Amino acid sequence: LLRPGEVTPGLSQVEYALRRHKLMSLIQKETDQTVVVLSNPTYYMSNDIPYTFHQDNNFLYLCGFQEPDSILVLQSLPGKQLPSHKAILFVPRRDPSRELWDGPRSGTDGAIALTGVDEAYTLEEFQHLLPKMKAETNMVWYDWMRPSHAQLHSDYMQPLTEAKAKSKNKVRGVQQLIQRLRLIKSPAEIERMQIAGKLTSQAFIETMFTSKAPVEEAFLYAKFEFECRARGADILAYPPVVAGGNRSNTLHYVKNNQLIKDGEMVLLDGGCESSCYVSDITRTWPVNGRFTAPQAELYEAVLEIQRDCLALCFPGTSLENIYSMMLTLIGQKLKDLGIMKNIKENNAFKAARKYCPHHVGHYLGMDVHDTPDMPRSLPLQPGMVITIEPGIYIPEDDKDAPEKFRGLGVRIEDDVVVTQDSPLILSADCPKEMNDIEQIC
Amino acid sequence: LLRPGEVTPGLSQVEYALRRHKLMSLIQKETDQTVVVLSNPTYYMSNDIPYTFHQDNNFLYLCGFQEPDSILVLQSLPGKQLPSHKAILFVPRRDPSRELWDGPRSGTDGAIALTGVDEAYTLEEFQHLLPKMKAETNMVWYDWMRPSHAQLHSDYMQPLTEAKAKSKNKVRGVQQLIQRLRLIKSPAEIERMQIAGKLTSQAFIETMFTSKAPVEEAFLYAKFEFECRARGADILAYPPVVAGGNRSNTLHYVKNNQLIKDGEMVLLDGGCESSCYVSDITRTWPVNGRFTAPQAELYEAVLEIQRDCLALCFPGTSLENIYSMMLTLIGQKLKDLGIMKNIKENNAFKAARKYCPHHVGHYLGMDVHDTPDMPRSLPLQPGMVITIEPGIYIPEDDKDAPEKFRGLGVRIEDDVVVTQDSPLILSADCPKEMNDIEQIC
Numbered sequence: 002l003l004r005p006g007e008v009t010p011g012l013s014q015v016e017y018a019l020r021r022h023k024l025m026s027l028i029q030k031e032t033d034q035t036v037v038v039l040s041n042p043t044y045y046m047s048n049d050i051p052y053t054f055h056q057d058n059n060f061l062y063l064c065g066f067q068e069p070d071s072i073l074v075l076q077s078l079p080g081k082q083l084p085s086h087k088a089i090l091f092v093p094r095r096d097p098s099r100e101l102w103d104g105p106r107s108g109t110d111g112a113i114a115l116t117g118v119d120e121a122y123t124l125e126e127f128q129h130l131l132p133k134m135k136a137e138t139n140m141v142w143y144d145w146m147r148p149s150h151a152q153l154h155s156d157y158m159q160p161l162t163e164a165k166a167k168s169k170n171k172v173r174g175v176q177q178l179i180q181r182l183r184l185i186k187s188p189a190e191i192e193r194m195q196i197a198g199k200l201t202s203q204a205f206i207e208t209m210f211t212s213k214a215p216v217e218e219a220f221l222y223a224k225f226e227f228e229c230r231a232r233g234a235d236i237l238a239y240p241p242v243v244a245g246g247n248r249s250n251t252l253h254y255v256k257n258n259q260l261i262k263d264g265e266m267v268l269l270d271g272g273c274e275s276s277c278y279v280s281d282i283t284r285t286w287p288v289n290g291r292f293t294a295p296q297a298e299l300y301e302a303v304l305e306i307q308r309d310c311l312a313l314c315f316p317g318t319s320l321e322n323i324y325s326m327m328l329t330l331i332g333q334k335l336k337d338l339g340i341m342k343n344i345k346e347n348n349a350f351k352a353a354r355k356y357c358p359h360h361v362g363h364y365l366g367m368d369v370h371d372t373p374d375m376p377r378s379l380p381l382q383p384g385m386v387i388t389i390e391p392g393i394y395i396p397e398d399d400k401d402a403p404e405k406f407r408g409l410g411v412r413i414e415d416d417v418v419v420t421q422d423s424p425l426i427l428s429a430d431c432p433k434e435m436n437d438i439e440q441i442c
Numbered sequence: 443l444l445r446p447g448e449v450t451p452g453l454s455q456v457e458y459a460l461r462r463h464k465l466m467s468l469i470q471k472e473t474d475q476t477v478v479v480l481s482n483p484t485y486y487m488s489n490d491i492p493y494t495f496h497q498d499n500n501f502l503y504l505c506g507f508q509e510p511d512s513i514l515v516l517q518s519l520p521g522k523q524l525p526s527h528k529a530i531l532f533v534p535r536r537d538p539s540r541e542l543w544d545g546p547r548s549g550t551d552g553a554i555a556l557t558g559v560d561e562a563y564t565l566e567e568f569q570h571l572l573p574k575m576k577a578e579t580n581m582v583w584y585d586w587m588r589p590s591h592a593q594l595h596s597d598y599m600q601p602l603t604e605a606k607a608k609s610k611n612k613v614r615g616v617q618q619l620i621q622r623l624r625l626i627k628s629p630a631e632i633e634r635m636q637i638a639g640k641l642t643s644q645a646f647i648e649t650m651f652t653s654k655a656p657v658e659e660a661f662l663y664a665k666f667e668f669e670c671r672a673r674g675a676d677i678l679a680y681p682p683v684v685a686g687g688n689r690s691n692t693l694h695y696v697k698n699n700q701l702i703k704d705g706e707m708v709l710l711d712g713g714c715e716s717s718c719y720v721s722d723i724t725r726t727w728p729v730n731g732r733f734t735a736p737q738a739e740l741y742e743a744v745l746e747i748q749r750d751c752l753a754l755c756f757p758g759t760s761l762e763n764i765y766s767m768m769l770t771l772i773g774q775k776l777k778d779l780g781i782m783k784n785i786k787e788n789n790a791f792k793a794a795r796k797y798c799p800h801h802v803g804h805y806l807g808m809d810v811h812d813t814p815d816m817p818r819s820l821p822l823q824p825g826m827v828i829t830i831e832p833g834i835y836i837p838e839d840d841k842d843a844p845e846k847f848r849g850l851g852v853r854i855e856d857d858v859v860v861t862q863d864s865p866l867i868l869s870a871d872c873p874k875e876m877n878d879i880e881q882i883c
């Protein structure tokens with residue numbers, strides 16, 4: 002739960018206020034200014050059946066408020082330069098006839114008390130801001146292209162956006178500025194990510210421990226998800242990959258419903274969300290507990306590639322540089338393994354991209370593919386968090402590879418915090434040396 | 443998992459052909475005729491992360507094909523009356539560069555071999571049907587208002603639909619005719635629903651068996667879902683309700699993230715999908731294994747109401763009649779329990795609706811709220827499947843109820859097949875008598 006002063010676990014009112022300050026500092030670099038960020042709605046599986054609520058992550062990042070159908074406004078102060086501003090929440094009025102179904106919601110006074118924003122009003126009072134926002138002298142920052150909340154957009158912001166679009170001061174997108182902030186984690190955010198990584202690591206360990214041969218993919222999925230949730234994870238962070246044998250070579254395999262035979266490996270990519278931050282981990286292991294000789298050759302190859310790429314996660318290198326290194330190292334291993342017979346086959350990285358068709362990694366945070374418009378060519382800085390997830394995939398019908406490798410796929414994925422010196426591996430507790438894996442099984 | 447001749451487990455090629463025959467017979471009762479049903483797409487959590495595929499249920503009902511981005515067409519035959527027709531599947535051409543990611547897909551010959559439709563072609567050949575379908579002499583049956591697949595609709599059927607909308611022969615909806623068929627289950631469908639009900643009943647039993655106090659809602663959720671999936675359930679059928687203590691009175695409680703204390707009950711509404719059909723079961727029990735005296739009084743009242751309503755599930759009665767009975771019986775129990783002090787309080791069922799604000803039940807089948815446009819005033823017929831789910835809910839702040847009942851909510855929900863005589867309770871294996879519950883906990 003929450004320590005005094007916390008809005009969400011580990012994250013204080015002042016930390017949220019400092020995020021808002023930094024956003025208004027970014028806007029100042031770009032008369033009156035207004036930022037509008039919508040919350041998520043409640044989504045429905047069918048007309049009378051709701052899904053569990055998940056907040057919009059940009060809304061959540063800036064104020065920590067975990068209820069639907071709300072609007073955050075940051076407004077410049079008359080006679081003061083940015084980054085001075087006030088933060089205002091607009092929330093639904095209390096409605097007992099709806100709380101019977103959906104549960105209690107915050108008052109305006111409750112929203113202020115929890116979050117520490119300056120002011121709060123009901124949604125119906127948002128209209129009083131719109132005349133001033135409509136003026137050609139008012140710069141409005143709002144993500145109108147793909148609104149987070151279709152009805153809030155339609156009712157409260159689409160007329161404003163269309164009115165300003167025919168003016169000299171059009172609405173400007175803001176989510177790309179929020180991404181710049183989410184790119185650099187605070188110590189408190191790193192601690193949240195560490196907790197998620199340790200919890201997920203334990204879920205992997207228990208799933209390896211109960212591995213047997215043969216075993217259903219659906220059972221390993223069920224066990225993994227049970228262990229995450231029983232350990233306090235709120236949700237899984239993405240649909241897991243639980244891909245056995247040759248299905249490990251299907252890169253977006255999520256159906257997880259086939260039997261894994263004795264002598265096959267499972268590729269299990271699984272992560273969870275805890276206190277608003279995620280993990281994203283992949284391990285490959287033999288379900289009977291013992292690597293075969295070709296499985297061990299291939300696995301150790303990927304582990305050595307991953308080791309070398311993890312050592313590059315220091316300030317100044319970029320994900321793009323690390324991807325270049327990965328493809329170079331994959332080419333070396335394909336030669337060593339006898340998969341690549343002629344060195345020229347990795348011209349333009351052709352062989353390496355054939356055997357690892359995906360990138361080396363991505364930014365990680367409140368989302369799995371965190372801040373996706375931030376370039377992978379950016380130099381890494383302390384506080385950025387990335388994955389490193391090389392793999393090598395040899396389809397069973399790949400007659401250009403040695404027969405002993407056909408039908409084997411391996412990926413090893415860890416989550417990494419860049420620091421001033423050595424990277425912090427959030428997923429360090431999750432075994433990946435072959436001897437450690439065989440000991441657990 | 444398929445016997446020879448089966449398209450999906452338990453459902454033969456000829457059973458699917460007979461559903462198509464019956465649909466064309468319904469259309470005959472309403473020159474050439476064409477029925478178009480789109481499949482579902484692959485949905486994405488974010489740009490590069492797919493969810494597990496689930497077929498559109500109307501498409502699935504009519505042909506059993508479990509792959510995305512496809513179109514089913516039923517076409518009248520020249521010079522022959524309905525219900526004679528041909529069934530055609532249009533499927534994506536195979537594409538190795540996409541199969542690397544999503545896995546193998548069926549050929550046209552594969553789709554025909556699996557399903558038993560008459561013909562199959564790739565999507566690029568769908569265009570050859572459109573000139574004849576656009577003709578004013580061609581009646582087209584197609585659900586355009588909320589398309590199952592936005593992109594297939596935009597690319598393949600929206601131009602046709604708009605052209606006919608500007609003609610004397612507009613496109614006619616068809617999903618309401620499919621609902622009329624899905625309303626009456628075949629013996630093979632009833633067997634699938636029985637399997638889903640037994641599996642779910644076992645997951646409840648396991649969750650009761652390890653119940654303890656205190657216990658986290660999230661843990662009971664994790665345990666229930668594990669037990670369903672471990673037994674082969676494909677997915678949960680809806681977000682479960684795992685609501686302890688006074689939260690049992692929040693009717694759409696799905697957050698499932700609070701502690702249930704010693705002396706409190708849990709209301710657990712959970713169901714799964716197995717071989718394309720769902721269950722929908724609610725049980726309420728004390729997490730410490732022993733009903734208190736007021737919990738027992740309230741629980742036995744709801745059980746008695748439910749027993750009486752289940753006994754009304756015979757041909758000729760309607761869901762609306764059973765709802766009327768439920769409200770009448772609730773009024774009797776509120777009086778007996780001392781919640782309702784004056785008999786006139788159930789004038790217009792006012793008190794009963796206060797204490798049970800939801801309906802007695804709904805149709806059940808491939809969907810949880812199955813065939814939702816079929817009237818609840820229809821007389822029940824053999825083969826219809828419904829739920830019966832009365833409850834009584836006493837908020838902790840309800841000062842008009844005796845103090846001993848405040849903060850208690852009870853619902854008991856079973857799934858029922860109407861037969862020529864007495865109903866078949868699909869969920870009969872799931873204990874609900876108080877003695878049976880206490881023995882299992």
Ligand SMILES: N[C@H](Cc1ccccc1)[C@H](O)C(=O)O
Binds near residue numbers: 253271369
């Ligand atoms: N687990 C993630 C996302 C994912 C992709 C496809 C299926 C399931 C999850 C993977 O590491 C990635 O960064 O692409």
Ligand SMILES: N[C@H](Cc1ccccc1)[C@H](O)C(=O)O
Binds near residue numbers: 050
């Ligand atoms: N379990 C279902 C659907 C459901 C509703 C609300 C939350 C979760 C599930 C419930 O019996 C009903 O028929 O309404």
Ligand SMILES: [Mn+2]
Binds near residue numbers: 270271282283390
């Ligand atoms: Mn991953």
Ligand SMILES: [Mn+2]
Binds near residue numbers: 281388390414
């Ligand atoms: Mn990843």
Ligand SMILES: [Mn+2]
Binds near residue numbers: 711722723855
């Ligand atoms: Mn239910």
Ligand SMILES: [Mn+2]
Binds near residue numbers: 722829
């Ligand atoms: Mn129900």
